[PDB]
Structure formats: C-alpha cells, structure tokens
Design a protein around this ligand. Structure first.
Ligand SMILES: O=c1cccccc1O
Ligand SMILES: [Zn+2]
Length: 257
C-alpha cells in the first residue's frame, strides 16, 4: 500500500490513483513574484473560539488531531471562499532534517514542516459528501520553521509518546488550535487537491505567508513517531511530504501587496 518509502512513495502513487497526474494536484511551488494580488479577496475569517478537539490518531502516515464537526463550531470562511467550511482535523507533514518537510514551497524554499487544518463545505452535509465535490474542502496551510518554541504546540508534542505506532489513538480534548496560528493571516490561494491518496481534487488551498516557529526539540519529537504498527519493524515517521507538482493551468493569487 502507498506510503513514503522507495517502493511505495509519491512517484508510485499514480498506479493506484491515476488522479496523481491530474490537472489540479497539490502541493505546488508558490512563485511569489508570479502570484498576483487579488484585491477582490476578503480577509480570511478563522473562528475557532468554540472548537472541540476530541482525539489524536497515528494513522500510519501522520497524526491527526480530530474535532467534533457535528455542529458549527470551528469554521473557516471569507478569503477566497463562498460559504462556510467546518474544521474536521489537523495534521502535519515534516522532514528527517530541518532543511525539508513542507509540501508547499515558496520560491523553491522548503520549510521544516507544514500544518494542514482541514475543513469541509457545510453545504455538502458531511466530509464524505464534500470530497465528491470540486469545492468540498478548504485547507489552511501554515509553514513551520525551527527557532523559538511554539507554546501552543506543546500539548500535542507531549501526547505523541502515547500514539507512537500506526493505529494508536489517545483522548485529546480541550486543545485550542488558535495557538498554532501566526500573527498575520496574509495568504496565497489556488485550487488543488488532497496531498495523500486518494488525492482528490476538492481543495481550495489557503497557504499563510507567515511561518510559525517551533523548537528543534518540538520537531525532534515528531520524528520519533513510527509509520509501522506495534510489533513491526520500526520505521521512523519522517519525510511524510509529497513534493511540488506541476502547476498546469492555474494561477496562485495573493491576498496582500
Ligand atoms: O492536507 C491534506 C488535506 C486533505 C486531504 C488529503 C491530504 C492532506 O495532506
Ligand atoms: Zn496534509
């Protein structure tokens, strides 16, 4: 089955998921000079005050912090979006070394990691119906650089010992994802896809310009997780990023001058 190794990595995905070579795949390189300011974009509205986290799960490719999405509680709207998108989960992608790990790149620069806050369009009733639609998802992408610690990340780092291997979960209530956001909500946006199989082309990407800083100790702890299940040979969960894909017939728009 798919993964991030030599034999089952991103270059192989297209055999089981032909949409891998589709017209609006993600991630992409953001060429900052070629991304045009769009003064018709709105400010992003991130309303996470009532977000209810439930659980954290190692799914064998990342860890997901899952939210209760059965009511309108943690929503994204505005910016490029029409309508209301509900947060369902966040996760990260990261590297084996600080010099790589992000999925999106900025003028070919790779950040140490990238956070994805996944939201589904509430006009489609739930996540599963939303991923049958070209405007089903909105993903807020936030870059991580290594420097100062992010205090709001620490509750996540500290629970990872308890979900080391694939299939493990832990209760993870009362986690406030506002503590993962940078100061500025300036963003780039484009139409694209999920970045893991099944790579569905549902996503309005909203990629914040400002990274967050995390400490070397915080990212080191991500790197102790395992792709494998308990009792299987240990394979460190590192380099769980898909490289930049061809832009094709798309324009990346900037919310800022
Ligand atoms: O960020 C993601 C969002 C939606 C679907 C699939 C995979 C991802 O990494
Ligand atoms: Zn992701």
């Amino acid at each position: 089955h798919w993964g991030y190794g030599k034999h089952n990595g991103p270059e192989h995905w297209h055999k089981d998921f032909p949409i891998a070579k589709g017209e609006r795949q993600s991630p992409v390189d953001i060429d900052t000079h070629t991304a045009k300011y769009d003064p018709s974009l709105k400010p992003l509205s991130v309303s996470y005050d009532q977000a209810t986290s439930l659980r954290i799960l190692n799914n064998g490719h990342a860890f997901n912090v899952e939210f209760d999405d059965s009511q309108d509680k943690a929503v994204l709207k505005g910016g490029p979006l029409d309508g209301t998108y509900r947060l369902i989960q966040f996760h990260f992608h990261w590297g084996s070394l600080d010099g790589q790990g992000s999925e999106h790149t900025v003028d070919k620069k790779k950040y140490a990691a990238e956070l994805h806050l996944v939201h589904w369009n509430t006009k489609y009733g739930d996540f599963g119906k939303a991923v049958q639609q070209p405007d089903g998802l909105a993903v807020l992408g936030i870059f991580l650089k290594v420097g100062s610690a992010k205090p709001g990340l620490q509750k996540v780092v500290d629970v990872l010992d308890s979900i080391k291997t694939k299939g493990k979960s832990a209760d993870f209530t009362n986690f406030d994802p506002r503590g993962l956001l940078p100061e500025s909500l300036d963003y780039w946006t484009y139409p694209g896809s999920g970045t893991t199989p099944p790579l569905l082309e549902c996503v309005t990407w909203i990629v914040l310009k400002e990274p967050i800083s995390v400490s070397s100790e915080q990212v080191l702890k991500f790197r102790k997780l395992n792709f494998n299940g308990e009792g299987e040979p240990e394979e460190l969960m590192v380099d769980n990023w898909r490289p930049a894909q061809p832009l094709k017939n798309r324009q990346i728009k900037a919310s800022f001058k």
